[PDB]
Amino acid sequence: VNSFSGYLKLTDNVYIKNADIVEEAKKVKPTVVVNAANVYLKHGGGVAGALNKATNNAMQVESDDYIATNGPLKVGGSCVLSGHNLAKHCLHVVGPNVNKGEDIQLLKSAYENFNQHEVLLAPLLSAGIFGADPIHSLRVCVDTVRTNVYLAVFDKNLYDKLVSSFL
């Protein structure tokens, strides 16, 4: 049993809800929240900008020190950092950004990072300002992630479309 409430069950392991991932993290304090990161961990906008704002910029401070030490992530890669006031840990995952011309096949590699964590609160990778089709992102998620993933979809319209169209 876990703390996640109000989710629709899509599969054995994948759950979805219309929710603001920031407000959901603040309520649940999950072990892992996933950030929709870029390779530079520059948390300017989208999910990353919202998560970072909710930490009062402490996520960005920690991320800048990580990059200074380790250099940029790979597209499809991840790192584990603090979850600050939102979660125990934040898994920063880099999905391909279609608005930069990155290979959408890298979306499966991105979701494979989730399999290193038994339970996660996450957004749909490469959705929103990363430019991918969220219906495709949900299909890759279901077909790739084997651990228990609770997906937060900010937009009610999109949430209803993802559910209605789910095979």
UniProtKB/Swiss-Prot annotation:
Membrane topology, from the record: Multi-pass membrane protein
Query: Subcellular location, in the record's words?
Result: Host endoplasmic reticulum membrane
How does its activity get regulated?
Inhibited in vitro by GRL-0617.
Reaction it catalyzes: Thiol-dependent hydrolysis of ester, thioester, amide, peptide and isopeptide bonds formed by the C-terminal Gly of ubiquitin (a 76-residue protein attached to proteins as an intracellular targeting signal)
Q: Which residues form the Macro domain?
A: 1-167
The effect of residue 31 to A is: In strain: Mu/B.1.621
Q: Which domain of life is it from?
A: Viruses
> Outcome of residue 164 to L?
In strain: Gamma/P.1
Q: What does this protein do?
A: Responsible for the cleavages located at the N-terminus of the replicase polyprotein. Participates together with nsp4 in the assembly of virally-induced cytoplasmic double-membrane vesicles necessary for viral replication. Antagonizes innate immune induction of type I interferon by blocking the phosphorylation, dimerization and subsequent nuclear translocation of host IRF3. Also prevents host NF-kappa-B signaling. In addition, PL-PRO possesses a deubiquitinating/deISGylating activity and processes both 'Lys-48'- and 'Lys-63'-linked polyubiquitin chains from cellular substrates.
| Subunit and partners | May form homohexamers. Interacts with N protein.
Q: What is this protein called?
A: Papain-like protease nsp3
- Underlying gene: rep
Parent-protein residues present: 1025 to 1191 of 7096
